[PDB]
Design a binder for this molecule. Sequence first.
Ligand code: HEM
Ligand code: HEM
Ligand code: HEM
Ligand code: HEM
Ligand SMILES: C[C@]12CC[C@H]3[C@@H](CCC4=CC(=O)CC[C@@]43C)[C@@H]1CC[C@@H]2O
Ligand SMILES: C[C@]12CC[C@H]3[C@@H](CCC4=CC(=O)CC[C@@]43C)[C@@H]1CC[C@@H]2O
Ligand SMILES: C[C@]12CC[C@H]3[C@@H](CCC4=CC(=O)CC[C@@]43C)[C@@H]1CC[C@@H]2O
Ligand SMILES: C[C@]12CC[C@H]3[C@@H](CCC4=CC(=O)CC[C@@]43C)[C@@H]1CC[C@@H]2O
Ligand SMILES: [Cl-]
Ligand SMILES: [Cl-]
Ligand SMILES: [Cl-]
Ligand SMILES: [Cl-]
Ligand SMILES: [K+]
Ligand SMILES: [K+]
Ligand SMILES: [K+]
Ligand SMILES: [K+]
Lengths: 405, 405, 405, 405
Amino acid sequence: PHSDTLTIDPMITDLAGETSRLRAAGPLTRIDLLGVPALAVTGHTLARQLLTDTRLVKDINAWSLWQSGTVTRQWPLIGMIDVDRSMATVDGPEHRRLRIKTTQALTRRALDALKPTIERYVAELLDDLERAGADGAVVDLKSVFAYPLPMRVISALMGVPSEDQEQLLTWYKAFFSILTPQDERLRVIDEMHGYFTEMVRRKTAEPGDDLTSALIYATDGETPLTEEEVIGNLQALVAAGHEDTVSLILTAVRALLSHPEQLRLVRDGEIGWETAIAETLRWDGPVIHLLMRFATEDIDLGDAVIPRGEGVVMSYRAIGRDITVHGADADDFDITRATAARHISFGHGPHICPGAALARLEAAIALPALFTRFPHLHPALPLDQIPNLPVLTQNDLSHFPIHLG
Amino acid sequence: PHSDTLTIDPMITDLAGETSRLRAAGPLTRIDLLGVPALAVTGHTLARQLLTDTRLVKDINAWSLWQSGTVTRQWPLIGMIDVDRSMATVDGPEHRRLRIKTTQALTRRALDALKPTIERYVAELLDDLERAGADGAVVDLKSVFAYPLPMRVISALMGVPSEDQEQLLTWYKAFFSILTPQDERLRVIDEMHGYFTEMVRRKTAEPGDDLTSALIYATDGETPLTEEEVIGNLQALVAAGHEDTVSLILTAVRALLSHPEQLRLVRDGEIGWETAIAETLRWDGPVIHLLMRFATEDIDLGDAVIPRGEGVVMSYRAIGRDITVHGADADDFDITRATAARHISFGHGPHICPGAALARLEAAIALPALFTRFPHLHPALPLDQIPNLPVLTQNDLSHFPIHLG
Amino acid sequence: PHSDTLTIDPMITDLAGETSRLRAAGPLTRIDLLGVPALAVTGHTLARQLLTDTRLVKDINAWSLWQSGTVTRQWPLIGMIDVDRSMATVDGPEHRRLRIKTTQALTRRALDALKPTIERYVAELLDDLERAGADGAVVDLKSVFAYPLPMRVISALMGVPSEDQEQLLTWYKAFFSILTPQDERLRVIDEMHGYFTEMVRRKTAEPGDDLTSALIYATDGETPLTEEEVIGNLQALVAAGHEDTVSLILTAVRALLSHPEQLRLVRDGEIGWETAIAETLRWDGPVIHLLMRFATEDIDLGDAVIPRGEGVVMSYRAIGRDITVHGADADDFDITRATAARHISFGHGPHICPGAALARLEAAIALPALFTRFPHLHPALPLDQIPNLPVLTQNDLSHFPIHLG
Amino acid sequence: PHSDTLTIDPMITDLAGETSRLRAAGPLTRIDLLGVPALAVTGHTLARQLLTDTRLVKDINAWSLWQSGTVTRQWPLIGMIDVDRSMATVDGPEHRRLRIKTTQALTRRALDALKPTIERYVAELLDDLERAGADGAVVDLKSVFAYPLPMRVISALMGVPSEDQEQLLTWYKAFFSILTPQDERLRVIDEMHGYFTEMVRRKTAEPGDDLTSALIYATDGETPLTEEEVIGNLQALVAAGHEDTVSLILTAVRALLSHPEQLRLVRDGEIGWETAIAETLRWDGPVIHLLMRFATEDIDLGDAVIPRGEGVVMSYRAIGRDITVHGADADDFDITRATAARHISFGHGPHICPGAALARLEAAIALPALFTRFPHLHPALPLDQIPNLPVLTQNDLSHFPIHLG
Ligand code: HEM
Ligand code: HEM
Ligand code: HEM
Ligand code: HEM
Ligand SMILES: C[C@]12CC[C@H]3[C@@H](CCC4=CC(=O)CC[C@@]43C)[C@@H]1CC[C@@H]2O
Ligand SMILES: C[C@]12CC[C@H]3[C@@H](CCC4=CC(=O)CC[C@@]43C)[C@@H]1CC[C@@H]2O
Ligand SMILES: C[C@]12CC[C@H]3[C@@H](CCC4=CC(=O)CC[C@@]43C)[C@@H]1CC[C@@H]2O
Ligand SMILES: C[C@]12CC[C@H]3[C@@H](CCC4=CC(=O)CC[C@@]43C)[C@@H]1CC[C@@H]2O
Ligand SMILES: [Cl-]
Ligand SMILES: [Cl-]
Ligand SMILES: [Cl-]
Ligand SMILES: [Cl-]
Ligand SMILES: [K+]
Ligand SMILES: [K+]
Ligand SMILES: [K+]
Ligand SMILES: [K+]
C-alpha cells in the first residue's frame, strides 16, 4: 500500500526492502521515526552537497519540533541527538577546536604506535575462538571475537580500564536497543554520563598516555576544553569507535564467506584487503541512518525546499546503493567494482568520521588474521538467516554462528 | 535428501520440519545430538509404555557411551545428564524418598498458601509492562514480564534471596545456550553448584519458611537427605521451575494472539483458561527433547529392540503432535479439541513433573491478568518472525515485541 | 510493516488482505479514508449493538471534523455523506415519516405487482446475451446483463423514463469512481440533483403509477414531504437500488461458477436460490464500508470509548467474515453453512435497507433464469483475475468475460 | 502443455509469456486468432525480408479463407482487415499515389507548422492534471492527459471539429475492445464510416487548412482520389494517429517511472528523449500484431514455405524482443543500449508508418513537459498491476493512476 511517508520499521524486519524503497523515493523523501517526522537524504550527490551546506546544523535547539516541545526525552531515539556538547553537536568555526586533538591522534602515522596493541588483542581473541571452537563446536563469532575487539582497542586509546569494559558493553547494548524501556534507557544514559564524568576526573588528577588526557591537557594553544566538551568527545569516540567497528568486522566476514571467489582474491593478494573493506562499507556499512541535522533557514534545492527547523537524516545505507554512482549492480557485493572507494560511509564535510583510519586499520589487521588462522571457517547457520538486532539507525547483527573447520 | 539418522539442528532453524520428520520416522527413530547417537521416542503410546518400563533408567553410568569414555564433559549437552544425585537421576524405591517432600509441598491445596505471593508478582510485573509501554512504545513481553515472573515464584518457594535472582538468570541463559563455549559452560555449572551449596549451608544454619528448609529438616521418618541430594533437588526445582514456565507463558500468549477467536472463547467464559493452557502444552510445550534414559538390558518392542546401554530421548514436542491420538489436525492450535488434556507434556510414570500444579497455577493467574489489564495487547512484530534461542532441548523464545494498545 | 491506523487503499489492490486485517484489528479499529480519520466497526455483535444505539446519528453536522471545517467538499468521499435530507440522513421520530411510504411499497406482497416487469427485463437481457455470445464469442456479463437490469427495475418502480437511464448510468460510474477528478465529481453530483429535481417537478404536474408519485402525493395523514425530502429519497433509492443489485448479481455468478458443486445443489433443488443469495451477501456483498455515523456524546463500550463527534464506519464486508459468528471457515463460500441467513449485509436497526425484498427478488429471478438458459455458461477469464473498480466503499467488479457454452 | 499453434489470448492475461513463446517458436510460427489460423512473423531479419516481398499483399481478396467464405464479418477481428481502399490495403505501383500527399504533409519540416498547436494542447492538458491532482488526489494519467492529447493533435491535422472528438473516442474504444458484441461492433464500424463520409462531403464543399482538404483537392498531378480512397486514408490516419500515440505516451511514462536512474539520464540531458522513445518503441511499443498479409503465390524460405492464400501477421512486439539483434538483455528496458534505434516498430518497406515523425514529435514534447511540470510524479498503484485492455493487436493500457507529488 502506497504512502508518501516511509515508516522506518523499528524491528528491521525488511532492511533490504526499506533501503530500496528509500532509494526509489529519493534523493529526498519524508520518513517517520517512531512517530516523529523528518526528511531522509538517500542520494549520493545530494548528500555530499547537504553535508557541506552551512545551513544544516546538528544543534537540537534548531529543531522546530524540539522548540515547540513536540519531541521530548520520552522519544526512544532522543539519546542519538540530545547529547552533551562535542564535535558531534557543533558546527562552524567552533567545530574545528573540538576536533583538532582527536584528528591529530588518529592520523595513520599516529596510529602506527597503536598497531602492536591491536595485534595483541586480535591474537588473544583468536585464541579464544580456538578454545571455543574445540571439538567442532559452534562458536558465536560476534561474542567471542568481533564484539570485544573494538572495545579493547578504543579503550586502550582513550584510557578506559580493562575491568570497566564489560559494564560499558552492557550499557551500550541497552542504549542502542529499541526494546529498552525508555525509563531504563534514560537511566542508562545517566549512568554512562556519570561513568565518563568520573573518568575525566580520574585522568585530570592522574593523566596518562591516552587520548582522554590529551583532551584534558591540550598544552600550548587555544581555550581549554570544558568538562562538558571533554566528556562529550569521550562519549562520542567510545560509542562510535566500538559500535561501528563491530558491525564492519561482522559484515565483512559475512560478505566474504557468501562470496568465496572474492575471498580468494583478497587471500591470494590479487585484491587488497582495504578494497574489500571499502566495498563492505559501501554495500553493508555500519550506519543505516545518521540523526540528525536541522535547517537554520529555508533551503531551496530547485524542485523542493527544506523548511527552516525541519530535521534531516542522512540515510547512508541507501546512499551506498546509489545506482547513479555505482551502476545497475549497486545492490551486489563486488570488491572488483571501480567505484568502491567512492563511498561516503564515513560521512563527508566537516563532520567526516575522525576515526576512519582506525576503523580501516582494525579491520585490515583482524580480517586476514582471522582467515589465515582458520582457513576453513564457515557458517553453522545460513548467512541470510542472521538477523539484525532491533536497532533503528545502526547495522547491528545479533549473532554469527560459525565452525572453525 | 533422505537419511536414516535425524540430526537435531542446534540453531533451531526448522523446528516445525524436524518435529514433523520425527513424527513421520517414529514412534522410535535414531537421532544425532551433536555427534552423539541416541534413540528418540516420538509416539504417544510408546512413550507412556517406556516411561513406565523399569528397564530404562536415568543414571548416566548405565550409558555404554559413558562407560567407554566415548562421551565426556566436553559434550555441550552433558550438563543435562551428568548432574548431582536427585529425583531426576534415581529410579526404583529410592526415587520415592527423594520426591516425597517435594510432592507434598506442591499439591494444589499446599499451593493455596503461595497464591497471594504469585498475585503480587503478577501485579508488580504488569505495572512494569504499563510503564515500559508508555507513549505507545514497543515492549519486550519476555524481558519485562514472562522472564522474571517464574524466577520470583520459584525463588519465593525455595528461599532464593531477591538480590541473587539476576545472577541465577544470567547463569541459566549461559547454561542453556548452545553458543556458550564449553569451558565457560562447565565453569557456569560449577558456579551454580557453589551457589546452591552455600544456599543449603545458609538454610541449614538458619532455616526458614521455604521448601529448601523442608528438604534439609524432615521429620523423624526416613533417612535425612544427604547434602548432595538436597542440592540436587534444589537445582532441578529451580532450573525446571524457571525455564519451563517462562516458555509456557510466552507460547500461550503467542498462540492466543495468533488465534484471537480462541482468545475470545476463554475471555468470554466459553472455554476455561486451564484448557487453553493444556492445548498450549500439547502443541507448543516447553520441552522439545528430554535427556536421557538408558536400557539396563535389551528391550523387545516387537518390531525393534533397544540394545542394552543405548540412550533414549523422549521427544515431547513430536509426541504432542501425535496424529493417532489427536487426529489429522494435530499440528493446529485448537483449544476446543477433545484431546487437549490428554497430553503428556509433563511426562508420565514415576518421573512425572512434580511442579505441574504450580506451572498451571502461575499461568492460570498470569494469563487472564495480562489480557484483562491490556485488552488491546497485540504484536509489534509478526508472531511467526519470533525466533527460538539456540537451545536444543528447550522451547526458548528469544524476545516478544508487543504494544499495549 | 505494522501500523495502528489501517489505510483503506483507494485502488482496491488487496481487498482480501484489508478485510482480514480489519477483522484481526477489530471489532473497533481506527482507519484512514483518504487522509480523514474514522473508526471502523468490523465485528458482528458490536455492529448490531451500535446500529441500534441512538447516540450514533447520520447527520454530518454532528461530525467534529465537519464542524471545524477540517473536511470539505474537496474530500473525494463527501458525496457519500453530505447529501440532501432523506431517510438516509435523519434519525429519531422524523426518520419513520421519511421511510413509511417506501417500506409500504417495497413489501414482498407489494412487489408481486412488479414481478412480471422484472421477468420481462430478465428475458430481454438474456436475449441480448444470446446475440452477444453468437459464434462462441466472449461476452461481458456485466455490460450486457447485470449492469442494465437493476437500473431498468428501479427505473420502472420510480418512474425514470427509458431514454434517460443511459445518462444515469454514466453519472453513477463517475460518482462512484475514485479516479474522477473532484471538480468533475461535484459537477456530476450537481447534474444528478438537477435531473431528479426536474423529475419531481414532472411527476408533480403529471403523476403516474410509480413510487415517486406516491412520495409526492400521500394521503391526508401526516405532513407532506418537502421537495428536498422527495428528491433525497428518490436519489437514495435509485443509487442503492442500482449500484448494490448489480454487485449482488455479479458476485453470485462468480461464487457459483467457482463452486460448481454448490451451483449443482441449487439447480437440483437441494438448496434454495435465496440461500445461495444469502451466502453471497455474507461472503462477498455489495457494501464494503458504510459512511458514516457520528457520536452525539461519548459512547462507553467497556474497553474503549467513542468520543463525541467521531465518525464511525460500518465495515459490512469484514463483518460478514466474522469468525465468532460464522466459524473458522468464514472466509469460504459455502451455501450449506448454518449461519448464512444470519448476515447483516442489509444493515440493522432503523436504517435497515428498505429494498432488501426487491434485491432478493431480482436476484432470485435473474440467477436461475441465467443458468437455465445457458447451462454451460463458464468464464473466458480466470475468475480470480476479475478486478474491482477503484470504488472504495462499494464492491464493484470491472467486467465479467464469459462464454455461453 | 505443448501445442504447435499458439493461441493468442483475447484477454491478454499473459502478454509477457506469449511474447516469449512467440519468439521461442519463431521466426515463423503458426498462431490462432479467435478460431482463425495464420502465420506469425516473430523474427527481426525475416520481418524486414517479408515486409519488402512483393508476394505478400494486404488485399483481403487474396486470403484463401476469405475466398472460401470461411472467415466472415462475424469474426471479431474483421474490422482490422476488411476496410475501405486506402494506403493500408493497396500494394505495388498504385500504393505510392495513395501515400504521397500524406507523406508530404508529415515531414519534419511540414510538422514544424503544427508544433505550436501540439504545445498548446500539452499545456492545456497539463493544467487539467494540475486541477485533477489538487490536494494530493489520485489522477488517471490516461483519461486526463495521454488519452485526449493524440486525438486533439490528429484532429487538428485532419480537420475533425473539436465537438466531435468525444464521439470518435467512444467509437474507437468499442471498435478495439474484444468485449464489444459483434453486432454492435459492425454497427459502430458503419457509424464511423458514415461520420467520415460526411466529413469528406463537408470538406469538399468548404475546404480548409487541413490534410483532409489536401487529399480531396490534390491540385496539380495524378488522378484525383476517389471518395472511398479519401475516406479510407482519413480513417486509417485518425485510428492509428490516436490509438498508437496514446500507447507510446503511457508506456514511456511507465518505463521511465520504473527505471528512475534512466529517467534521470534524459532529464539531465545525458541521453536524448528521442533515444528513450526509441527504446520504448522497441521494448513496449503500440502494436502487438499487425493484421494481415497474404501470399499471392507460394513463398519459399528454404526450410519452410508460406502457401498461396495464407495469412501472415507481423508480431512487432515479439520482433522488438529479438535476441539476435538486441542481445541477451532484449527483454530489459535500457535506453543506453546501442541497438535502440534499430527497431522496426513503425514497420518496414512500402507500408512503413507515415506518421512516425509526428508520433516522435508528440512524445518528445509531451514527455519532458510532463516531468518538468511534475518532477515528483509517481504511481499511486504498483506499475506492474496496470492491466492491458482486452485488445488483441494493440498494446492498450486500461488506466494509469498517479499522484502529482
Ligand atoms: C567502523 C567504521 C565507522 C564508520 C562507517 C563510521 C561512520 C561515521 C559517520 C557516518 C559519522 C557521522 C557523519 C555525519 O555527521 O553525517 C561518524 C562520526 C564520528 N565517528 Fe565514525 N565511523 C566508524 C568508526 C569510528 C571510529 C573507530 C571512531 C573512533 C573514535 C569513530 C568516531 C567518530 C566520531 C567522534 C564522530 C563524530 C565526528 C563529528 O561529528 O565531527 N568512528 N562516523
Ligand atoms: C511449566 C511447565 C513445565 C513442564 C511442561 C514441565 C515438564 C517436565 C518434564 C517433561 C519432566 C521430565 C519427565 C521425564 O522424566 O521424562 C519434568 C520433570 C521435573 N520438573 Fe517439570 N515442567 C514444568 C514446570 C516445572 C515446575 C514449575 C517445577 C517446580 C519446581 C518443575 C520441576 C521439575 C522437576 C524437579 C523434575 C524432575 C522430576 C523427576 O525426575 O522425578 N517443573 N518436568
Ligand atoms: C442489492 C443488495 C443491497 C444491499 C446489500 C443493500 C445494503 C444496504 C445497506 C448496508 C444500507 C445501509 C445500512 C446502514 O445504514 O448502515 C442500505 C440502505 C438503503 N438501501 Fe439498500 N441494499 C441493497 C439494495 C437496495 C435496493 C434494491 C434498494 C431499493 C431502492 C435500496 C435502497 C436503500 C435505501 C433507500 C437505503 C437508505 C435507508 C435508510 O438509511 O433509512 N437498496 N442498503
Ligand atoms: C505512435 C506510434 C506509432 C507506431 C508505433 C505506428 C506503427 C505503425 C505500423 C507498425 C504500421 C503498419 C506497418 C505494416 O504495414 O506492417 C503503421 C501504419 C500506419 N500508420 Fe502508424 N504508428 C504510429 C503512429 C501513427 C501516427 C501518429 C499516424 C498519423 C496519422 C499513423 C498513421 C499510419 C498509417 C496511415 C498507416 C498505414 C500506412 C500504409 O499501410 O501505407 N501512425 N503504423
Ligand atoms: C551515531 C554514532 C553512534 C552514537 C553516538 C554518535 C556520536 C554522538 C553520541 C554521543 C552520546 O552521548 C551517545 C552516542 C552518540 C549518539 C555516533 C556518530 C557515528 C556512530 O554511528
Ligand atoms: C530438563 C529440565 C531443565 C534442566 C534440568 C532438568 C532436571 C535435572 C537438572 C539439574 C541440574 O543441575 C541442571 C538442570 C537440569 C538438567 C529439568 C527437567 C524438566 C526441565 O525441562
Ligand atoms: C451507500 C449506498 C450508495 C450511495 C447512496 C446511499 C444512500 C444515500 C445517497 C444519496 C445520494 O444523493 C447519493 C448516493 C447515496 C450516498 C446508499 C445506501 C446503501 C448503498 O450502498
Ligand atoms: C492497426 C492500426 C490501427 C487500426 C487501423 C490500421 C490502418 C487501417 C484501418 C482502417 C479502418 O477503417 C479501421 C482501423 C484500421 C484497421 C492501423 C495501422 C497501424 C495501427 O496500429
Ligand atoms: Cl574505505
Ligand atoms: Cl495441563
Ligand atoms: Cl438474504
Ligand atoms: Cl524511434
Ligand atoms: K529527483
Ligand atoms: K543481482
Ligand atoms: K530457424
Ligand atoms: K533481466
